Amino acid sequence: MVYQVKDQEDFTKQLNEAGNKLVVIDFYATWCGPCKMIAPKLEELSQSMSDVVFLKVDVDECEDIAQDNQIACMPTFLFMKNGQKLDSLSGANYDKLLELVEKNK
Amino acid sequence: MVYQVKDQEDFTKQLNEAGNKLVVIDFYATWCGPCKMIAPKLEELSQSMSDVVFLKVDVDECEDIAQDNQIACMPTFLFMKNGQKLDSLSGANYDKLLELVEKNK
C-alpha cells in the first residue's frame, strides 16, 4: 500500500516513521494520466519490498509541499533516506525508478 | 493580455471568440517555479501580438481541463486554431515558444 501524505507535519512524521529505509515519494495529480498508469505498479512494489517505504503526495492537495520540492512534472519521484534527498526522477519511467530504488535502498 | 480560463464552458467561449486566430494556452500551477518564471514573458508577448489569443489555465482550479488535455510537465503550452490542436510544448523554453507561435500564427 502507498500512504498519502496529508500535510507538511505528516510528511516529517512519515520520514521519521521510515527509520533507515529508503523512502520513495510519488508527487502526482488525479488529472495526470501517466500518474494513474504507474500507480498500480507502485502499489505492487510497495506490497513486495519491505526495505523501502513508498509515499504519495497529491500536488493539488498539498500545494505547499509541491512548491517546496520544486515539482514541475507529474509524476515526480523523490528519493530520500534518513531525511536526506538522494535523487529525483521526473516522469513515469518504471525502469529508471526501479534502478534508483535498487541503487539507494 | 493573458486571460485566465474559469472553467470548461469559459474555455469553449474563448476558443470561439478567437475566430481564426492562433490560440496559445499556458497550463500552469501557482506552485510551479518555471511557470512563474515565464509568465511575465507570455504577458509581454500577448500585449504585442494582437493577432494571437493568449490564455492560461490554472491546473489546480480547472483539474477537469487539465485532465482533458493530458497535461504532464508544466508549464505546458498548447497551440490551437479553430478549436483544433496544432502543437504542444512542455517546459519554459521561450525560444521554442516563439518558434511555435511564428510557425502557427
Q: Residue B85 to residues A30, B80, B92, B93, B99: CA-CA distances in angstroms?
A: 23, 5, 19, 19, 16
CA distances A70 to A65, A67, B88, Å, are: 9, 5, 22
Nearest CA distance, A50 vs chain B (angstrom): 30
Residue A63 assigned to a binding site: yes
Buried b (16+ CB within 10 A) or exposed e, B13-45: ebbeebeebbbbbbbbbebbebbeebbeebeeb
Q: Is B74 on the interface with A (CB under 8 A)?
A: yes
Check CB contact under 8 Å for A29 and B73. Answer: no
Is A33 within 8 Å of B67 when comparing Cβ atoms?
yes
d(CA A49, CA A47): 6
- Among B32, B42, B52, B100, the one annotated catalytic: B32
Tell me how far apart the alpha carbons of residues B62 and A71 are, in angstroms, rounded to a whole number: 18
Domain B1-105: which CATH class? Answer: alpha beta
Nearest to B58 by CA among A54, A17, A98, A29: A29
Closest residue by Cα to residue B23 from B53, B45, B2: B53
B39 has a chain A CB within 8 A of its CB = no
Q: Does B8 touch chain A (CB under 8 A)?
A: no
Min distance A75 CA to chain B CA atoms (Å):
8
Measure CB to CB from residue A32 to each of B31, B34, B72 and give the nearest one.
Answer: B72
Contacts of B31 (CB under 8 A, 6+ apart): A59, A63, A64, A66, A67, A71, B60
Resolution at which this structure was determined, Å = 2.0
Inter-chain residue contact A64 with B31, CB threshold 8 Å = yes
The approach used to solve this structure was X-ray
